[PDB]
């Protein structure tokens, strides 16, 4: 029954509202959302990016999502959030080990989650390869966040990553 620290764009209200939505989802009322509980959502199972989000949200990497991580996780999409914050999030979709770079095999696997059988593995591998070659400005063979943004800044997809709370 101690108080809870977090960093986010929300005020007491939006946080209180989010808390009701959190309680509703916590079935076992354990205080931290499991993947099983997430996937209980009908719309959600039709979605290849879900566990990425969950894995990104799960800051502590324990496999669930406590309320702090829940809030900070959403806060990313707040209308008050800026361009970089949203882009940084996107980056982390591809950066599976969270080491801060997007590796080759990583970029492959993540894409594979999204295209599935609409591509032969060799084809996917190739565009995956050439992408890096053309974006790896530093020659390391993976992708920094700086280099990532170099490709996509002009796309303003970040403007599409907004939710009303």
């Amino acid at each position: 029954s101690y108080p809870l620290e977090m960093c986010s764009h929300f005020d007491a209200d939006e946080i209180k509202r989010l808390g009701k939505r959190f309680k509703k989802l916590d079935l076992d009322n354990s205080g931290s959302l499991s993947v099983e509980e997430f996937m209980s959502l009908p719309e959600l199972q039709q979605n290849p990016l879900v566990q990425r989000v969950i894995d990104i949200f799960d800051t502590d990497g324990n496999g669930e999502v406590d309320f702090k991580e829940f809030i900070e996780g959403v806060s990313q999409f707040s209308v008050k959030g800026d361009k970089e914050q949203k882009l940084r999030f996107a980056f982390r979709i591809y950066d599976m080990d969270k080491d801060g770079y997007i590796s080759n095999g990583e970029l492959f696997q993540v894409l594979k989650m999204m295209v599935g059988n609409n591509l032969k593995d060799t084809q996917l591998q190739q565009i995956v390869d050439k992408t890096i070659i053309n974006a790896d400005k530093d020659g390391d063979g993976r992708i920094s966040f700086e280099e990532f943004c170099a490709v996509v800044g002009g796309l303003d997809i970040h403007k599409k990553m907004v939710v009303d709370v």
């Binding site: 959502l41 719309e43 590796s103 095999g105 591998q125 997809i157």
Partner: protein, 377 residues
């Protein structure tokens, strides 16, 4: 190390230098060059520029209408299909010991147009008098602007290189006169062309105009019912290209007799068997017209063969061949990020909104591509 499909070849991050591309006499190192390119390697931009320009200065010195001796292997559309181009030289023979004539259309539609051009110009420089290149309809700014070539150039190299290519194209000859029997051209005939001298008289050094003889040579097709036409009418307007004409069996026959030629060899029209031989001339008993087409399984969907013509010992033999596997590219050379990202944005947004509402065939393919045969606006 992290890589998933390690079987698959990783492309040279190296860019070939002047010393790796030209030997001490200035001759290109094609074996080195062919290999790099097949591994999807790039050159230094300056080396690329050198090749395009050294080739262009040769072309600039050639006549509008080349005079070409047999034996010769003659070829149709290429359309960026570099990996088939490789197979082609295998089938038609080594440029080292074979005389070649290409009827244009080297770029567009294929995602390896710049490689074809590079390799081709390289070979021209090496074999200035035994390898010959002509102009297709795609060798111009208008179409490359409209299709992928301009784009291909920027991604892989620069626009500065695309421009160098545009200038090199203006130098491309328009027609060949083969063994004093065949007029060879990309498209076909023109109402404004009666004799061969008529061809010699043109200024080819420019972007092809929207009207007139230089346009017609690059753009003309024969009638759909060629040889069996209901009228003895020569030219009618090409309602399929949007410009230029359809020419009729009489038209070709009049021109052939008037100029004492045996036939006309052309590309410009996709063919399932990689070639098409048209109605025999009544006089010569030899097909008045031949279409040749050298892009097998064109656009990856026609599943057509390609062919080349090998003229030798008085025999016109058609060698056919099938497609060869090649690297995948996302359309308009997109990278995986630009392609996938908006899908991501949608998909996570989709997710969060959801979470927050917890509380309240040849002929087939031929038909689908008619707008793309036609002229860009």
């Amino acid at each position: 190390t992290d890589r998933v499909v390690k079987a698959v070849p990783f492309p040279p991050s190296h860019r070939l230098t002047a010393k790796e591309v030209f030997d001490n006499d200035g001759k290109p190192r094609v074996d080195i060059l062919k290999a790099h390119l097949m591994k999807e390697g790039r050159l230094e931009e300056s080396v690329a520029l050198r090749i395009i320009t050294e080739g262009a200065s040769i072309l600039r010195q050639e006549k509008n209408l080349l005079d070409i001796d047999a034996p010769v292997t003659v070829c149709g559309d290429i359309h960026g299909q570099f990996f088939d181009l490789m197979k082609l030289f295998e089938v038609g023979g080594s440029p080292a010991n074979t005389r070649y004539l290409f009827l244009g259309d080297y770029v567009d539609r294929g995602y390896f147009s710049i490689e074809c051009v590079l390799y081709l110009w390289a070979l021209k420089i090496l074999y200035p008098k035994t390898l010959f290149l002509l102009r297709g309809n795609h060798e111009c700014r208008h179409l490359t602007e409209y299709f992928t070539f301009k784009q291909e150039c920027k991604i892989k190299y620069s626009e500065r290189v695309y421009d160098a290519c545009m200038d090199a194209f203006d130098c491309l000859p328009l027609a060949a006169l083969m063994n004093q029997q065949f007029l060879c051209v990309h498209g076909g005939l023109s109402p404004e062309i009666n004799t061969l001298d008529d061809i010699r008289k043109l200024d080819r050094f420019k972007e092809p105009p929207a009207y007139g003889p230089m346009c017609d040579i690059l753009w003309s097709d024969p009638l759909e019912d060629f040889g069996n036409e209901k009228t003895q009418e020569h030219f009618t307007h090409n309602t399929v290209r949007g410009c230029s004409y359809f020419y009729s069996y009489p038209a070709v026959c009049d021109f052939l007799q008037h100029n004492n030629l045996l036939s006309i060899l052309r590309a410009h029209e996709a063919q399932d068997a990689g070639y098409r031989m048209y109605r025999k001339s009544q006089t010569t008993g030899f097909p008045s017209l031949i279409t040749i087409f050298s892009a097998p399984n064109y656009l990856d969907v026609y599943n057509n063969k390609a062919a080349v013509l090998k003229y030798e010992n008085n025999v016109m033999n058609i060698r056919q061949f099938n497609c060869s596997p090649h690297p995948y590219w996302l359309p308009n050379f997109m990278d995986v990020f630009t392609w996938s990202l908006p899908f991501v944005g949608e998909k996570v947004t989709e997710m969060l909104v959801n979470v927050l509402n917890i509380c309240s065939s040849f002929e087939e393919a031929k038909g689908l591509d008619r707008i793309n045969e036609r002229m860009p606006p």
